[PDB]
Amino acid sequence: CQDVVQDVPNVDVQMLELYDRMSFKDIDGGVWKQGWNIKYDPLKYNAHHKLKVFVVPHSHNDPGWIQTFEEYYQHDTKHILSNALRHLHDNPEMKFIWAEISYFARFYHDLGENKKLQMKSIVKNGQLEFVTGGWVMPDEANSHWRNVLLQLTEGQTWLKQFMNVTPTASWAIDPFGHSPTMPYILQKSGFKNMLIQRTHYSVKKELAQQRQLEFLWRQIWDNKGDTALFTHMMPFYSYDIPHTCGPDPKVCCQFDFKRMGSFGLSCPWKVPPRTISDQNVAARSDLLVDQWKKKAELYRTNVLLIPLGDDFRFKQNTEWDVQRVNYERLFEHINSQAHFNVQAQFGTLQEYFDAVHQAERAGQAEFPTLSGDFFTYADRSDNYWSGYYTSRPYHKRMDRVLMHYVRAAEMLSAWHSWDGMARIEERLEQARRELSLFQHHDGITGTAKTHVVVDYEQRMQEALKACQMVMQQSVYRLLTKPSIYSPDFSFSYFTLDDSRWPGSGVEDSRTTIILGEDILPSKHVVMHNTLPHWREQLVDFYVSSPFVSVTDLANNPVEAQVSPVWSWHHDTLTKTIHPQGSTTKYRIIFKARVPPMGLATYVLTISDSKPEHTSYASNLLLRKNPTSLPLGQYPEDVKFGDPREISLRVGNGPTLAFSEQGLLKSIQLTQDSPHVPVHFKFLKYGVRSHGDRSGAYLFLPNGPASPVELGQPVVLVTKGKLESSVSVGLPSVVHQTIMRGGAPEIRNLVDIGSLDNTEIVMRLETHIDSGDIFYTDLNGLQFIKRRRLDKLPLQANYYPIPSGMFIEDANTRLTLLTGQPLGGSSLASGELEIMQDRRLASDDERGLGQGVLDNKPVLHIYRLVLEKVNNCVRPSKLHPAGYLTSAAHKASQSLLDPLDKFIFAENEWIGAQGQFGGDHPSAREDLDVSVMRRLTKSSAKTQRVGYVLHRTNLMQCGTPEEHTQKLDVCHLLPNVARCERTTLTFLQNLEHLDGMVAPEVCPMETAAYVSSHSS
Ligand SMILES: CN1C(=O)[C@H](O)[C@H](O)[C@H]1CN[C@@H](CO)c1ccccc1
Ligand SMILES: *[C@@H]1O[C@H](CO)[C@@H](O)[C@H](O)[C@H]1NC(C)=O
Ligand SMILES: [Zn+2]
């Protein structure tokens, strides 16, 4: 195993180092506005060294943006694909690349057999080539790596089955900035090349000057370079035709033959395209070849990529003709005029890469090595695209919830083979596809129109319901005596209970367990643990009486706590935000202990009075002018008092102090230790009143944030033996700090209401001497060092926070883990901040054509981990990575993959069993079974089950935590007959494994295995 901590990789370009050195000056470079006037030696090219030019027709098809997926499919994409089929069939030298398999699958399944066969033939023959082959072309900022893999696998599995192809070149022309998580997954999915486009205009200029636009992109910790993937960065402002032929868009636009008038298009540079004729072809070729030769100067080989396309291009028959015929006339002239020393043709992306590497092998170029990322993107001036790290935060959080329900549903149902009548494969396919669709760079990014956002939400809601149906059928099967098991596949044996989604105060949707002497004495509940290690975790249920006690299925008493059910209401009468307590339902909380990848059953039982093993929380309402708060049968009266500082400690964990406004002020780790200043504060950013306006994409604040005026907010303190909390009703935010004996959990119920042109930020203020350094994660996969740069505007120092961020000095670290991707930064030493929501009246001129005024209440969740790190083995000051501790990693897992909770629906569960998976290996804490997926239907003689295994890297801080069992996924199911290592998409076998044993993976590695079973 490579050491990912102690060896700083030696690379030609390291992006944090490059950032430190660059000036980022935005000067007018001429026709290439963000570059310089390119010059070339006309004599570079000659009879023995020609420029080989590949013109690659393409059509960027967004799976939802201004229209829904289906509206675009009906109005544009079905015609593009239909006419591609006809035009490529009829013109054998014409070529076309296709990226978005969600659309291609929608189209293909509507084709007659005659046309399916024509389509297979133009793919087989190389005229139509798929690039990447994902369901979509995903966002790279907000997306979790698990879901990037999911959507890649969904599209590539479809391509292998129906088109018999697996792309090895990736095409990512539109995500707003780019992440090294992409080459990481792609290189472990068989890819050999990838292309990116949207990177900061200063980076394009800098890399172009050094001919470093093509590079071997390796991970920031990778000393050897085995993760490296060849990458092509496009050099110019856009992937459209004006910005892809060469440096001067006034010239390139004359070669977009759709822009002549009848198509309702024109050239902003005021010179139209002209049809190519025998009389003008020489002149036109001399303009175009000059553009090509200038572009060629920015790259190292004599092979040149010229994309030819734009959004939803190549629709009309007349458009296919006008592009193809004019380019054929140019190629014929250019290729026949020796003085140009060019050979130009239509080509595919793979053709371009193959020729580049032929040039490399011929010794004509060596490519530089690069590590780091390409955030935060700016396309011009100070227009940094950090706004979309937060836009539509409700769906950003929904993404993480569905991420987990997909994994759990696929896992739970993988243990058995299911009859076709069970509709298990059917429901899982719908769930995977709706989640995969939302990875699109207008989905999770929150940059689609209101009605399109609604479509994605409805689609995800259907996916959640599909997951629940699969999960609960699976649980009933796994925990019922087999000779009693009698499934109705439409029936709800269990309902899922989820405490954090949509969340209290977002949707009243949790069911109460209704118990009573005259109705039902007891109720079975079941917890599922998707992680491959034993887990204890507090779980809570709503119940109809405070007098409930908990047992396991051996009837052992389990300690429980009952609290009230509290909801916060904006009282239009008193103009206050204050809590109301239920008089009919209560919360019961207890510790569930669940096997690795397993299930555990508990029983809740009512009695007429306080049970022995159930305690009751006290509740203290702090506000001047209190009124009574009756709580039904709840046995402890609520106490009242004026606002005041408070301190709490659960178990033997940290002691937290709060301000009289209910916000954290300090954490004391142990009985002896200092009360370390850790202050939560809410602030607001506004919008500029002159110049460019913030919108869905751009963050353009009118200065540093200003404190939210809090007034005298109402504070609720609930204190229990198992769980305590402080909750406060702030303007736009009900802010809750929850304590269960370790790192606190923070929940924010965020309702920005009608505050237009406002972004609400949550900031932490500490005395950690972090300087200008902070750490943020990429796609939930790795933590990258950031350096705050005062030479850049505030918005440029915002980065994606897809799952976590931290600051540290020599002794102390604070980590904030998230349950949803949001934007954030560290704008001064000792600070962390993370945006909660943003409501923007204006459009930001990127094509969306609206502000963001469709906000809705969202429950954001966090864990907050303050730790001593002076004893940890940390990377050197020059290493570009950072690593979590054990506690912070577990805290992240608690947010993203909690225990699932199931309530038995019927009155009696005959044949119920107490546990499943007690004999599953409890793997080392840095290892996860990220994916468990049965890959065969029940008719297959040889069953196959796929696993994706991910090992993270946790700091060594002198806490052994030792003795664990080896996890061999190939023996999780009986009668194993074969075990293979595969690509992460399961589509290619890489290694046949001795003794049918899957080896565990190295830190920061991810592997896939498929076990085969003869049963
Ligand atoms: C920023 N964008 C998005 O959010 C979409 O994904 C779209 O493809 C892309 C914009 N494409 C450009 C054209 O190349 C465009 C710009 C304005 C209006 C229409 C399209
Ligand atoms: C699938 O593709 C491979 C590529 O080499 C080929 O050998 C095989 O015959 C193809 N299967 C078909 C044509 O169905
Ligand atoms: Zn796009």
The values of phi and psi at residue 739, to 5°, are: -125, 125
Fold agreement between 493-617+898-919 and 920-1015: yes
CA angle at 867 for the pair 862 and 870, rounded to the nearest 5°: 145
**DSSP letters of 846-912?**
SS--S-B-----EEEEEEEEEEE-TTS----TT-SEE---HHHHHHHHHHHSPPEEEEE-SS--TTB
Question: How far does residue 311's CA lie from ligand 1's centre (Å)?
Answer: 7
Question: How far does residue 127's CA lie from ligand 2's centre (Å)?
Answer: 16
- The reply to whether ligand 1 has any atom less than 6 angstroms from the CB of 61 is no
Token pair, residue 346, equals 């239509």
- The reply to whether ligand 1 has any atom less than 6 angstroms from the CB of 388 is no
Nearest Cα neighbor of 664 from 723, 783, 745 is 745
* DSSP β-ladder status, 858-868 and 812-818: antiparallel
Quote the CA–CA distance of 1006 and 1015 in Å, as a whole number: 28
- The reply to whether ligand 1 has any atom less than 6 angstroms from the CB of 846 is yes
Length of the chain: 1015
- The reply to whether ligand 1 has any atom less than 6 angstroms from the CB of 256 is no
Q: 10 Å Cβ neighbour count for 876?
A: 9
Question: Which residues pair with residue 522 across a beta bridge?
Answer: 605
3-state secondary structure 717-729: EEECCCCEEEEEE
Domain residue spans of the chain: 1-381, 382-492, 493-617+898-919, 618-897, 920-1015
Quote the CA–CA distance of 943 and 286 in Å, as a whole number: 62
Specify the residue with its C-alpha closest to ligand 1, atom 19.
Answer: 847
Are residues 477 and 566 in contact, defined by beta-carbon separation less than 8 angstroms? no
- The reply to whether ligand 1 has any atom less than 6 angstroms from the CB of 174 is yes
299 DSSP assignment: S
Quote the CA–CA distance of 349 and 307 in Å, as a whole number: 9
Quote the CA–CA distance of 799 and 826 in Å, as a whole number: 10
Q: Which of 69, 80, 311 to mutate to test the pocket of ligand 1 (most atoms within 8 A of CB)?
A: 311
Tokens 């796994």 — which residue?
478
Reported structure resolution in angstroms: 1.7
Quote the CA–CA distance of 783 and 775 in Å, as a whole number: 6
- The reply to whether ligand 1 has any atom less than 6 angstroms from the CB of 120 is no
Q: How many CA atoms lie within 13 A of 376 on its CB side?
A: 30
Question: How far does residue 475's CA lie from ligand 3's centre (Å)?
Answer: 40
Question: How far does residue 846's CA lie from ligand 1's centre (Å)?
Answer: 7
Q: Which CATH superfamily is domain 1-381 in?
A: Glycoside hydrolase 38, N terminal domain (3.20.110.10)
Quote the CA–CA distance of 139 and 141 in Å, as a whole number: 6
Quote the CA–CA distance of 360 and 576 in Å, as a whole number: 70
For the domain made up of 618-897, the CATH class stated in words is mainly beta
Quote the CA–CA distance of 57 and 95 in Å, as a whole number: 6
Question: How far does residue 213's CA lie from ligand 3's centre (Å)?
Answer: 22
Binding positions: 60, 62, 174, 441
Question: How far does residue 158's CA lie from ligand 2's centre (Å)?
Answer: 15
Are residues 810 and 870 in contact, defined by beta-carbon separation less than 8 angstroms? yes
Q: What is the C-alpha radius of gyration for the chain, rounded to an integer number of angstroms?
A: 30
Tokens 């990258």 — which residue?
784
Specify the residue with its C-alpha closest to ligand 1, atom 17.
Answer: 847
Quote the CA–CA distance of 546 and 560 in Å, as a whole number: 11
- The reply to whether ligand 1 has any atom less than 6 angstroms from the CB of 76 is no
The values of phi and psi at residue 656, to 5°, are: -110, 135
CATH number of 493-617+898-919: 2.60.40.1180
Quote the CA–CA distance of 212 and 367 in Å, as a whole number: 8
- The reply to whether ligand 1 has any atom less than 6 angstroms from the CB of 310 is yes
Method of determination is: X-ray
Are residues 871 and 886 in contact, defined by beta-carbon separation less than 8 angstroms? no
Token pair, residue 759, equals 């972004």
Specify the residue with its C-alpha closest to ligand 1, atom 4.
Answer: 442
Question: How far does residue 160's CA lie from ligand 2's centre (Å)?
Answer: 10
Q: Which of 139, 174, 310, 928 is catalytic?
A: 174
Nearest Cα neighbor of 78 from 42, 109, 123 is 109
Question: How far does residue 126's CA lie from ligand 2's centre (Å)?
Answer: 13
Q: Which long-range contacts (CB under 8 A, 24 or more apart) does 932-939 make?
A: 932/407, 932/410, 932/411, 932/414, 932/597, 932/969, 932/972, 933/410, 933/414, 933/986, 934/410, 934/413, 934/414, 934/417, 935/986, 935/1010, 936/417, 937/417, 937/420, 937/425, 938/417, 938/418, 938/419, 938/420
Residues 6+ apart with CB under 8 A from 109: none
- Topology of domain 920-1015 in CATH is Immunoglobulin-like (2.60.40)
Start-to-end Cα distance in the chain: 35
Whether 540 is catalytic = no
Q: For residue 160, which ligand has an atom nearest its CA?
A: 2
Q: Which of 174, 440, 453 to mutate to test the pocket of ligand 1 (most atoms within 8 A of CB)?
A: 174
Quote the CA–CA distance of 369 and 215 in Å, as a whole number: 5
Residues 6+ apart with CB under 8 A from 948: 149, 929, 930, 931, 984, 1006, 1007, 1008
Q: For residue 377, which ligand has an atom nearest its CA?
A: 1
Q: Which atom of ligand 1 is nearest to the CA of 66?
A: 5
Helix (H) or strand (E) holding 152: helix 145-163
H-type helices in 446-497, by residue range?
Answer: 450-478
Q: Which atom of ligand 1 is nearest to the CA of 176?
A: 1
Considering the domain delimited by 382-492, tell me its CATH architecture. Up-down Bundle (1.20)
Give the distance between the most distant pair of CA atoms in the chain. 100
Exposed/middle/buried for residue 816 (C-beta within 10 Å: 0-12, 13-18, 19+): buried
Q: For residue 443, which ligand has an atom nearest its CA?
A: 1
Q: Which of 72, 846, 848, 852 to mutate to test the pocket of ligand 1 (most atoms within 8 A of CB)?
A: 846
Token pair, residue 565, equals 């059910």
Are residues 446 and 698 in contact, defined by beta-carbon separation less than 8 angstroms? no
Nearest Cα neighbor of 860 from 751, 739, 708, 743 is 751
Residue type, 117: L
- The reply to whether ligand 1 has any atom less than 6 angstroms from the CB of 410 is no
Residues 6+ apart with CB under 8 A from 910: 480, 484
- The reply to whether ligand 1 has any atom less than 6 angstroms from the CB of 440 is no
Quote the CA–CA distance of 806 and 798 in Å, as a whole number: 14
β-sheet with 715-719: strand ranges across: 639-641, 618-622, 715-719, 724-730, 733-739, 745-750, 858-868, 812-818, 804-808, 773-778, 782-787, 881-882
Q: Which atom of ligand 1 is nearest to the CA of 239?
A: 14
Binding positions for Zn(2+): 60, 62, 174, 441
Quote the CA–CA distance of 259 and 275 in Å, as a whole number: 11
Nearest Cα neighbor of 832 from 683, 651, 981 is 683
- The reply to whether ligand 1 has any atom less than 6 angstroms from the CB of 849 is no
